């Protein structure tokens, strides 16, 4: 685990793309957490694309982690793979 921040890094119900193959695909955020025996890998994230290009219903070896997910548009991958489009607050 870690310390400092509390909760998912990627904004929920937001718009973010995903690096698939040799191209990116815009999508929406819904799930952002780790997986059993895959905590060291990082933090998986399920993005709900607008087009039918998903591949994750929201399960792991039988167990269900994401209910909102669906094997049609949603896509669980590494956050680093996701490509958001926000700047956030400023200050200088």
Number of domains: 1
**Shape, please?**
globular
CATH fold topology = SH3 type barrels
Helix content, binned percent: under 10%
CATH C-level class is Mainly Beta
Q: What is the CATH superfamily classification?
A: CAP Gly-rich-like domain
Biggest beta-sheet profile: 5 strands, antiparallel
CATH architecture classification? Roll
Discrete helix count: 0
> What's the count of strands?
7
Radius of gyration: 14 Å
Q: Walk across the major sheet and give the strand order.
A: 6-3-2-1-7
**SSE string, helix = H, strand = E?**
EEEEEEE
Portion in beta strands: 35-45%
Secondary-structure-derived class: mainly beta
Features:
mainly beta; Ubiquitin carboxyl-terminal hydrolase CYLD; SH3 type barrels; two-stranded antiparallel sheet; 38% strand; 5-stranded antiparallel sheet; 92 residues
3D structure, described in words:
The strands form two sheets. Strands 6-3-2-1-7 form a five-stranded antiparallel beta sheet, with no helix packed on it. The protein has a two-stranded antiparallel ribbon with strand order 4-5. The termini are far apart. The chain has one domain: CAP Gly-rich-like domain (SH3 type barrels, Roll), CATH 2.30.30. With 92 residues, it is mostly beta strands. It is built from no helices and seven strands. Residues 33-66 form the CAP-Gly domain.
């Amino acid at each position: 685990g870690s310390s400092g921040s509390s909760g998912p890094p990627l904004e929920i119900n937001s718009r973010v793309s995903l690096k698939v193959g040799e191209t990116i695909e815009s999508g929406t955020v819904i799930f952002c957490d780790v997986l059993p025996g895959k905590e060291s890998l990082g933090y998986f994230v399920g993005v709900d694309m607008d087009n039918p290009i998903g591949n994750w219903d929201g399960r792991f070896d039988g167990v269900q982690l994401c209910s909102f997910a669906c094997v049609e548009s949603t896509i669980l991958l590494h956050i680093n793979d996701i490509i958001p489009e926000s700047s956030g607050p400023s200050s200088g």
